[PDB]
Structures are given as C-alpha cells and as structure tokens.
Amino acid sequence: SMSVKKPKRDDSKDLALCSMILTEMETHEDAWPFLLPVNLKLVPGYKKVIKKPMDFSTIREKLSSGQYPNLETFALDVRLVFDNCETFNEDDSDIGRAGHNMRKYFEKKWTDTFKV
C-alpha cells in the first residue's frame, strides 16, 4: 500500500530474456504455423471466430518497440497464440499438434528462465 513497498525482483534482464526465449520459439521446427499472421482474407471464419489474432512476428515487433510493460503481458501474448490455435484447429491436425508442442516448449523455457 502507500509507502509500504514489497520487495520486487530485478527485472533489468527481462527484455533480453524474453527476446532469447522468443528466438528459440521462432527457430523451433514446429513454429511455422505461428511465424506470420493468419491471412484473414484467405482463411474462412478466422476473423469472425478469433477475436484477438496473434503470432510470433507481431510479438517480436511489439517486443522491439516497447509495447510490453512487463514480462507478464509478454507471456499473455504468447499464450494467446496457442489458445487461438486450440480454438480453431483440431488437436490431431498438424497445426493443432504444433500448438500443443510449441506451448509445452514455451512453458518449460518460461519456468527454466524465470522460476529457474
């Protein structure tokens, strides 16, 4: 509360670490469904069903221009990619299984990096 400060973690490395984690995402072999925005004019239903589209390149752009206030908001956008993926794709599909794989990869890097 006012004048009652909780100890807070050093966050000066956060931007560098999120960038590294995102680079590992981008270079994973199953990252191809998520490297670029879903083409809303070639994929039927996507714009109507998916209210907040998100992809790695957009996350990279936002990270490079100071649009994430904290690492939490960064993880929110990453999770959004895989949540949109689950919403639209069957679990057995190539894209659908990619998102499960890629989600697990991220959450392990997230834990290993910030909960270490």
Interacting residues toward ligand JR6 by CB under 6 A: 33-34, 36, 38, 43, 85, 88-89, 95
Q: Which is nearer to ligand JR6, 44 or 66 (CB)?
A: 44
Residue among 86 and 112 whose Cβ is closer to ligand JR6: 86
- Cα–Cα dist 5/19, whole Å: 29
Please say which residue, 17 or 95, places its beta carbon nearer to ligand JR6. 95
In whole angstroms, the minimum distance from the beta carbon of 48 to ligand JR6 comes to: 13
Considering the complex, what minimum distance in angstroms separates the CB of residue 71 from ligand JR6? Answer: 23
Closest residue to ligand JR6 using C-beta atoms? 38
Q: Which C-beta is closer to ligand JR6: that of 13 or that of 32?
A: 32
